[PDB]
Design an enzyme around this catalytic site. Structure first.
Site, PDB file in Angstrom:
ATOM      1  N   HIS A   1       0.792  -1.621  -0.162  1.00 43.77           N
ATOM      2  CA  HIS A   1       0.265   0.162   0.187  1.00 43.77           C
ATOM      3  C   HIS A   1       0.620   1.102  -0.250  1.00 43.77           C
ATOM      4  O   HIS A   1       0.362   2.170  -0.530  1.00 43.77           O
ATOM      5  CB  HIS A   1      -1.192   0.060   1.209  1.00 43.77           C
ATOM      6  CG  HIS A   1      -0.646  -0.425   2.132  1.00 43.77           C
ATOM      7  ND1 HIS A   1      -1.033   0.794   3.634  1.00 43.77           N
ATOM      8  CD2 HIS A   1      -0.887  -1.594   3.197  1.00 43.77           C
ATOM      9  CE1 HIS A   1       0.191  -0.270   4.588  1.00 43.77           C
ATOM     10  NE2 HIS A   1      -0.410  -1.313   4.361  1.00 43.77           N
TER      11      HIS A   1
ATOM     12  N   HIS B   1       5.833   6.726   6.412  1.00 46.03           N
ATOM     13  CA  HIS B   1       5.297   6.656   5.332  1.00 46.03           C
ATOM     14  C   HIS B   1       4.698   7.435   4.374  1.00 46.03           C
ATOM     15  O   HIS B   1       4.717   8.631   5.143  1.00 46.03           O
ATOM     16  CB  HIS B   1       3.820   5.137   5.138  1.00 46.03           C
ATOM     17  CG  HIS B   1       2.772   5.998   5.935  1.00 46.03           C
ATOM     18  ND1 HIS B   1       3.205   5.837   7.104  1.00 46.03           N
ATOM     19  CD2 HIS B   1       2.257   6.437   4.551  1.00 46.03           C
ATOM     20  CE1 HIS B   1       1.979   6.235   7.110  1.00 46.03           C
ATOM     21  NE2 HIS B   1       0.710   6.615   6.532  1.00 46.03           N
TER      22      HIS B   1
ATOM     23  N   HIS C   1       2.616   8.774   0.912  1.00 44.05           N
ATOM     24  CA  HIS C   1       0.637   8.924  -0.075  1.00 44.05           C
ATOM     25  C   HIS C   1       0.802   9.836  -0.905  1.00 44.05           C
ATOM     26  O   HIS C   1       1.844  10.675  -0.468  1.00 44.05           O
ATOM     27  CB  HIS C   1      -0.272   8.920   0.605  1.00 44.05           C
ATOM     28  CG  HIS C   1      -0.646   8.448   1.541  1.00 44.05           C
ATOM     29  ND1 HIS C   1      -1.391   7.188   1.623  1.00 44.05           N
ATOM     30  CD2 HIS C   1      -0.375   8.728   3.558  1.00 44.05           C
ATOM     31  CE1 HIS C   1      -1.682   7.393   3.253  1.00 44.05           C
ATOM     32  NE2 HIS C   1      -0.614   7.201   4.127  1.00 44.05           N
TER      33      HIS C   1
ATOM     34  N   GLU D   1      -3.406  13.628   1.497  1.00 50.16           N
ATOM     35  CA  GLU D   1      -4.772  12.780   1.578  1.00 50.16           C
ATOM     36  C   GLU D   1      -5.565  14.061   2.283  1.00 50.16           C
ATOM     37  O   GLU D   1      -6.635  14.744   1.663  1.00 50.16           O
ATOM     38  CB  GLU D   1      -4.569  11.542   2.934  1.00 50.16           C
ATOM     39  CG  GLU D   1      -3.700  10.095   2.202  1.00 50.16           C
ATOM     40  CD  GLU D   1      -3.704   9.697   3.053  1.00 50.16           C
ATOM     41  OE1 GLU D   1      -3.439   9.399   3.916  1.00 50.16           O
ATOM     42  OE2 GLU D   1      -4.532   8.371   2.215  1.00 50.16           O
TER      43      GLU D   1
ATOM     44  N   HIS E   1       3.051  11.286   6.602  1.00 49.24           N
ATOM     45  CA  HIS E   1       2.818  10.676   7.713  1.00 49.24           C
ATOM     46  C   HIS E   1       4.412   9.893   8.239  1.00 49.24           C
ATOM     47  O   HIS E   1       4.983   9.083   7.869  1.00 49.24           O
ATOM     48  CB  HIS E   1       1.009   9.161   7.577  1.00 49.24           C
ATOM     49  CG  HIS E   1       0.605  10.554   7.329  1.00 49.24           C
ATOM     50  ND1 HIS E   1      -0.493   9.535   6.656  1.00 49.24           N
ATOM     51  CD2 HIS E   1       0.256  11.766   6.478  1.00 49.24           C
ATOM     52  CE1 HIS E   1      -1.192  10.080   6.138  1.00 49.24           C
ATOM     53  NE2 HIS E   1      -0.677  11.891   5.852  1.00 49.24           N
TER      54      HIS E   1
ATOM     55  N   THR F   1      -5.995   6.492   7.956  1.00 54.59           N
ATOM     56  CA  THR F   1      -7.037   7.225   6.287  1.00 54.59           C
ATOM     57  C   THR F   1      -6.804   5.668   5.972  1.00 54.59           C
ATOM     58  O   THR F   1      -6.164   5.476   4.233  1.00 54.59           O
ATOM     59  CB  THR F   1      -5.666   7.594   5.844  1.00 54.59           C
ATOM     60  OG1 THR F   1      -3.784   6.945   5.561  1.00 54.59           O
ATOM     61  CG2 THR F   1      -5.810   9.087   7.141  1.00 54.59           C
TER      62      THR F   1
HETATM   63  N1  LIG Z   1      -2.055   6.647   6.613  1.00 53.95           N
HETATM   64  S1  LIG Z   1      -1.813   6.703   8.104  1.00 53.95           S
HETATM   65  O1  LIG Z   1      -3.542   7.250   9.084  1.00 53.95           O
HETATM   66  O2  LIG Z   1      -0.851   7.151   8.762  1.00 53.95           O
HETATM   67  C1  LIG Z   1      -2.082   5.013   9.107  1.00 53.95           C
HETATM   68  C2  LIG Z   1      -0.601   4.781   9.978  1.00 53.95           C
HETATM   69  C3  LIG Z   1      -0.614   4.304  11.064  1.00 53.95           C
HETATM   70  C4  LIG Z   1      -1.866   2.990  10.503  1.00 53.95           C
HETATM   71  N2  LIG Z   1      -1.300   1.973  11.191  1.00 53.95           N
HETATM   72  C5  LIG Z   1      -0.975   0.827  12.509  1.00 53.95           C
HETATM   73  O3  LIG Z   1      -0.720   1.864  12.862  1.00 53.95           O
HETATM   74  N3  LIG Z   1      -0.735  -0.395  12.620  1.00 53.95           N
HETATM   75  C6  LIG Z   1      -0.395  -1.018  13.623  1.00 53.95           C
HETATM   76  C7  LIG Z   1      -1.224  -1.333  14.827  1.00 53.95           C
HETATM   77  O4  LIG Z   1      -2.165  -2.333  13.692  1.00 53.95           O
HETATM   78  C8  LIG Z   1      -2.592   3.194   9.425  1.00 53.95           C
HETATM   79  C9  LIG Z   1      -2.913   4.050   8.799  1.00 53.95           C
HETATM   80 ZN   LIG Z   2      -0.252   7.447   5.725  1.00 50.70          ZN
END
Ligand SMILES: NS(=O)(=O)c1ccc(NC(=O)NCCO)cc1
Ligand SMILES: [Zn+2]
Ligand SMILES: NS(=O)(=O)c1ccc(NC(=O)NCCO)cc1
EC number: 4.2.1.1
Length: 257
Positions: free
Chosen positions: A61, A91, A93, A103, A116, A195
């Site tokens: 992703h 990471h 986007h 985003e 992010h 997100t």
């Molecule tokens: N794109 S975002 O809102 O920065 C984001 C950050 C962490 C996650 N997931 C995460 O930290 N999972 C660890 C626990 O299961 C998913 C999306």
């Molecule tokens: Zn993100």
């Protein structure tokens, strides 16, 4: 499973993750005129001097750089936050073209990409527990526009060819995330969500006003990654962004006037 294609993209996610239609979903459009300056907001405290990066991974992703979060080495505090949040990973986007990819949007403007930096509240002990709490995560969001190169991004860009397809990872030590930050730490903040699935409503969003500039060559390297694994039909990893979601009963606060 979920993705960013026609049949599994953001408009489909609610079928497996019904909180997608929830009350505090992210991202959102930041209407700069409606955001209210809050003089009670503190400056953000970014303490990354002892950060220990470990690996870089193509997760199908995005790509993420993961850090040692077993100790208070790279922490975010202050701003709108109570307590200390450990950096786990960052990471991005990004888009297929420079006019889309972020985003969050600012007065409906889309940036070419969005970084992010993901942090979790140490009072919950681990990130899996933090994601179950309304104040479990703090994500620092930084916009990328295309222009001059960002020298501190180059070490990331140069290794992406070794993690082209889903599931590939590489050792990625001694990366300093301070090289990704703009000059100003002025920010907007609002309560939101992850997100990507599971879209958990666990995030204090802190979105920096000032974008960083990256070069066309740098963002082109993002666009050469693949969503697929090896041996599967090649699908370039582009447009891995969720569009803005309804603000509903939320106010965005600004740390600046
Ligand atoms: N794109 S975002 O809102 O920065 C984001 C950050 C962490 C996650 N997931 C995460 O930290 N999972 C660890 C626990 O299961 C998913 C999306
Ligand atoms: Zn993100
Ligand atoms: N999580 S989600 O966006 O609601 C989702 C989950 C599985 C699918 N499955 C799918 O598309 N399967 C066909 C397999 O080749 C599609 C969307």
């Amino acid at each position: 499973h979920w993705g960013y294609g026609k049949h599994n993209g953001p408009e489909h996610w609610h079928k497996d993750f019904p909180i997608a239609k929830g009350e505090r979903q992210s991202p959102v459009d930041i209407d700069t005129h409606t955001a209210k300056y809050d003089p009670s907001l503190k400056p953000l405290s970014v303490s990354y001097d002892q950060a220990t990066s470990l690996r870089i991974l193509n997760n199908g992703h995005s790509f993420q750089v993961t850090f040692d979060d077993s100790q208070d080495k790279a922490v975010l505090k202050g701003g709108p936050l109570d307590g200390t949040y450990r950096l786990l990973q960052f990471h991005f986007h990004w888009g297929s073209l420079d006019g889309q990819g972020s985003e969050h949007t600012v007065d409906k403007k889309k940036y070419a990409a969005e970084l992010h930096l993901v942090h979790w509240n140490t009072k919950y002990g681990d990130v899996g527990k933090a994601v179950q709490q309304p104040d479990g995560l703090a994500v620092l969001g930084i916009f990328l526009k295309v222009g001059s190169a960002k020298p501190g991004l180059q070490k990331v860009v140069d290794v992406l060819d070794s993690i082209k397809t889903e599931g590939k990872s590489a050792d990625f030590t001694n990366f300093d995330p301070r090289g990704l930050l703009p000059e100003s730490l002025d920010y907007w903040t609002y309560p939101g969500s992850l997100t990507t699935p599971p879209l958990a409503e666990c995030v204090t969003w802190i979105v920096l006003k000032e974008p960083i500039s990256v070069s066309s060559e740098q963002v082109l390297k993002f666009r050469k990654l693949n969503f697929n694994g090896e041996g599967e039909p090649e699908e370039l990893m582009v447009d891995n962004w969720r569009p803005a979601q309804p603000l509903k009963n939320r106010q965005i606060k600004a740390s600046f006037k």
